[PDB]
C-alpha cells in the first residue's frame, strides 16, 4: 500500500555509495518505482550535510535539466547522520533521527551495507541493538557476503544469523540482477523447445564465461588479496551455473527457487587441481597505455605475487540430469574483450547422414554487452548447394527492443528488497556450499603458491585453458562465420 | 560429366517453354552448371528457326549486355525440329537430327515434356520407339497434372511405366525445388535442437499453408476442372507434409528418402468430410480491379460452378511418432497475401510456474516470400518486469545472406535431372497414395456438389476454417507482436 519506508545507506561517503547506491536509488525515485513515502538516510564517519553528499554524488546521477523539480524533491527526502561504526551512542542518534521522520517508528527499514566488510560484524551488532523498527519490517543488504576463507566467512555468517532471520538478510550477487541472467529461468521453464533437450543425453558441455579487457588499472593491491576465483568465479559464474543446472522449482517463490539452486550445489564435488588452469597477465609491449603494464608492474601489488588474474575450472554436477557433463567456468582480466556469457554445446546427432559435415549445435545466452540469445545450428547452405552449413537463429535485444531501457542490476535488486523478494539474493546454505566447493583448491593455492601461466594483455589467456576445454569434451572448429544482419 | 548431353524441349513454342524452360536452361548454362558438351533441341508443331525461338524467349532471359558472349555460345548450341506429336515420321526426323549432333548416337538424352497432358500418352509412345539412345541414358521430365482421380492417374502411370523404368521418369512437383523446402531435411536431421522435440509428445499440431492474393485472373476455366485440392493440396502441401513427418532415412540417396515419404502416406487414412472446409471467393465491392470480381464473375468459368478456391483439410498420420497430431492443410486463392509456410505448434509446458502467462512455442519455416526460419518462444519481458512475453529466435535469409542468389526451383530441378538425382521428384507409389487419400472425398464432392462457403477477395478465407483448426487443437491468441529488426 502506502506505508513509510526508510532507506539507510551505511557508508554514505564511501565510493560504492557515491557512485552506485545514491544514483541507483535516485533512478528508482525518478521513475516512480519507490513507495511514495520514502526517506533516504546516509550514515558515515565524516561530519557532512546533505548539500555535501549531493555535490559529491550528483555527478553520477546523469540528471537532465528537465529533472530539476524531481531532483529537489529527492534531496528534500534525504538526510545524513554522522557516527562511528562501533559506537553505541552514534547508532542511538541514528535511531532517534529515524523515529523523528514522518511515521518513523512505524516505517519499514532497509539498511544498505556499503562499507568495508571488515566492519560488518560491528555494524550488524549495533543495528540489531539500537535501530530496528518495532512495527515495520527490517532488512539488511550485505554487499560482500563472502569473506576471505571458509572460517572467517562462516563466523561472520553465524554472527549475522544469530541476530537476523534469513528473511531479513539480502546477500548481494549483482549478476542476479542482470537482464539475461534473470531470463535464464524463463528461457528454460516457459518453453518446450528447450525442455527435452536440457540434459546429459543432449548436452556435451556447458561453458560459463567472464571476460574483461582491462587489467587492475592501478588498484591491484585490493585485488591481490582475493584473486580471480574469489572475485568472479565462486560468486558470479557459480550462480549462473545454478540457474542453468537447477531442476524446475515448485513455483517462482523465492525459497522454492533457492532450494533448487542449493540442491545443484550439493551435488558438486570439490574441485580437483587437475581440472584447473591459472594465469597472470603480463604487459603487451606492442600495445598502448595501461596495456603495456603487467599485473606485477602495478606498484600497489606485492613484488613476486603469484595471484591469478585468469582461471579456467571444470566442475561436475553428479545427478541424473547432468552426470558426466562438464561445466567449464572460464574468467579473466586483461583479455581481448568484455563479455559475460552462457554457452551450451549439444552432442553430435546420432545416425549421421550428412558425411561428417555437421557441427554441434550451441545455445548462447550473452549477458553483456549487447544482450542477446542465439542458437547456432545447421541449415542447407543457401543457393545451389546440397550441403549443410552453420548458421543461427537469433534474438538481439538492441535491435528487437530498440526503445526499452534495461535497468542496471542494482536498480532491480534494490527494488526487489523494497518488494520483499529474496529470489535474486544468496541464501546462507548457497554460500556454505560455494565455500565447500572451492575451499580445498584455494587452500592448496595459498599453501603451494603455484606459479600461474603468463598471458599477454589483450589476448584470450593461456592456451592451456583451451586444451583443458578440449580434453573434457568441448569442440571448437573455428569454421562458423557470422556477418551482422542489422548493420 | 564429360559425356555429351542433349536437352530436348518438347513443346518448344508453347508458353511453359518460352517463359520458364528456355530461360532456366540458359541460367544453368551461363552459371557453368551444365555439362560442357550440352546441346538444346526444341521440338513443336510450328515451322520455326532458332532465331524465332530466341526472339520469342530472350525477353525472359534477363540477360545483361555483359553476357553477350555466353549468349551467343548458348544459341550456337541450340536447334529446332518441326513435327506433330503423333506422327512416326516427325520423330524419325528428330532422332536423325540428334544422331547428327556431336556424338549424338552416344549422348545422354533428356526430354522435357512442356506440352498439354492430353498428349502425354502419344509423346511417350513415340519417344520410346524412335528416339532413345542405345548407348546413353534416357530420361523424361513430366510436368503435372497426373490424372484427376485414382483411376485416370493410375492408367496414365501404367502407360508410362509399361514403356519407361522408374529411374527414367522424373515427375515434377516444383515445390521440391524451392530453397526452404529442401532445407526441411537438413533442419530436421542435422540438428539436435530439433530432434527430440519432433514428435507427438511435444507437437500439438502442424500447419501447412499455401496462400495467393490473386484469383483466377481470367483463366478460371482451366482451374475449374481441378479445384484447389487437386491444384495445390494433393501435390505441394502433401509433399511438405511428407518432409515434415518422415522418419530419418537410411541415407540421402533418392530412394531411401522417397521410401520414407511413401511410408508416411501409407499411414494416412482417407480424408473424411467432417474434417474439410471449402470456400469460393466472391468479389470485394470496396476493392479495385480484379479484386471486385468473384470466381463466378470470370466468364470462362461455367455458370453455377461450386468448385472450391479455398480448402482446409485435417489429416492424421497413424504411426508411433505422430498418432493423434493433426496436420492441417490450408490453401486458397484470392486471399490477403502470398505465402507458403510450415508451422509446428508445440504443446504447453507441463507444470506451469508462470500463472498461465505462457503461450505455446512455434517453429515456422517460411518457404516464400522472404525465406526465413524462426522459433516463437517466451522470454522475460525486457526491462523492469518479471513476467514472460512472446518473442522469437530468427533467421531471415534476406538479411543474413544479403549477397546470395537463391535459384528458381526449376534451375535446381533440371540440374538434378542432368545429375541423375530423383530425390526431388515424385515416385509412382507416392502418387498412388496421394490418390488413395483424396479420391473418396473428391468423388463425394463431385456427387453431392456441396456449395462452398463464400469469402471476400483479399480476406483470410472462411472463418469456419479457423474454427476447424481450433477444434482439432490449434491455439491462436493474437497477442504476439513482432517489430522488424531492419
Ligand atoms: N546476436 C549476435 O550478436 C551474434 C549472433 C551470432 C554470432 N555473433 C558473433 O559471431 C562471433 C562468433 O560467435 P561465437 O563466439 O558464438 O562462435 P565461435 O566463434 O565458434 O566461438 C565459440 C567459443 O569458442 C571459443 N574459442 C575460440 N577459439 C578457441 C580455441 N582455439 N580453442 C577453444 N575454444 C575457442 C570462444 O572463446 P572466447 O569466448 O574466449 O572468444 C567461444 O567461447 C562472435 O563474435 C559473436 O559475438 C553474434
Ligand atoms: N523473419 C521474419 O520475417 C519474421 C519473424 C517473426 C515474425 N514475423 C512476422 O510477424 C507476424 C506474426 O507472425 P506469425 O504469423 O508467425 O504469428 P501469428 O500472427 O500469431 O500467426 C499465427 C497463425 O495464426 C493464424 N491466424 C490469424 N488469425 C487467426 C484466427 N483468428 N484464428 C485462427 N488462426 C489465426 C495465422 O494465419 P495466416 O497464416 O492465415 O495469417 C497464422 O497461421 C507475421 O507478419 C510475420 O511475418 C516475421
Numbering used by the authors:
A (entry chain C): 28 to 514
B (entry chain L): 28 to 513
Please give sentences taken from the publication describing this entry.
Reduced glutathione (GSH) provides the cellular first line of defense against oxidative stress-induced injury, which can be maintained by NADPH generated mainly via the pentose phosphate pathway and its rate-limiting enzyme, glucose-6-phosphate dehydrogenase (G6PD). Accordingly, missense DNA mutations that impair G6PD activity or stability result in increased oxidative stress and a spectrum of disease phenotypes featuring, most commonly, hemolytic anemia, and collectively called G6PD deficiency. The glucose 6-phosphate (G6P)-binding site is located between these two domains.
We first began our efforts focusing on the Canton variant, with the mutation R459L, located in the β+α domain. Furthermore, the Canton variant was less thermostable; its T1/2, the temperature at which the enzyme retains half of its catalytic activity, was 42.6 °C, which is 4.6 °C lower than T1/2 of WT enzyme. To elucidate the molecular basis of the reduced stability and activity of Canton G6PD, we examined the crystal structures of WT and Canton G6PD at 1.9 Å and 2.6 Å resolution, respectively. Although no NADP+ was added to protein solution prior to the crystallization, both crystal structures contained NADP+ at the second NADP+-binding site (structural NADP+-binding site) in the β+α domain. However, we noticed a loose helical interaction between the helix (αn), containing the Canton variant-R459L, and an adjacent helix (αe), which was not described in previously reported structures. Thus, the loose inter-helical interaction in the Canton variant is likely to be a major driving force for positioning the loop and thus changing the orientations of these residues. Canton G6PD was more susceptible to degradation by chymotrypsin relative to the WT enzyme, which corresponded with a significantly decreased enzymatic activity.
